[PDB]
Amino acid sequence: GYIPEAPRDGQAYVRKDGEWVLLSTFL
Amino acid sequence: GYIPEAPRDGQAYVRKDGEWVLLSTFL
Amino acid sequence: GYIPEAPRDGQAYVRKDGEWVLLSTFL
């Protein structure tokens, strides 16, 4: 399987539950 | 040249060495 | 609408702005 691209808002995302979550949420 | 989808267990993954690595492992 | 694969040099990347950023940059 392959994931879909993450938003381009200059924010970092992590790949969780098929979605892009802000890395900062893990910070 | 895209990456494959990460697990959907509610965990966050980072993209390293062609694999999904638990973000929490980096925290 | 998927993202392209990150480097396979054992470094973890975060998805931000259509690019792979090192997770350690967030650590």
From Swiss-Prot, chains A, B, C:
Give compartment(s). Answer: Virion
Post-translational note: Cross-linked via an isopeptide bond to E.coli host protein DncV during infection.
Subunit notes for this chain? Answer: Homotrimer. Interacts (via N-terminal domain) with neck protein gp13; this interaction allows attachment of the fibrous collar and wiskers.
Can you quote the domain comment? The central domain consists of 12 alpha-helical domains (19-40 residues long) with coiled-coil structural patterns.
Q: What does this protein do?
A: Chaperone involved in tail fiber assembly and retraction. Acts as a chaperone helping to attach the long tail fibers to the virus during the assembly process. During phage assembly, twelve fibritin molecules attach to the phage neck via gp13: six molecules forming the collar and six molecules forming the whiskers.
Protein name stated in the entry? Fibritin
Which organism does this record belong to? Enterobacteria phage T4
Q: What is the lineage of its organism?
A: Viruses, Duplodnaviria, Heunggongvirae, Uroviricota, Caudoviricetes
Which stretch of the intact protein is present?
458 to 484 of 487
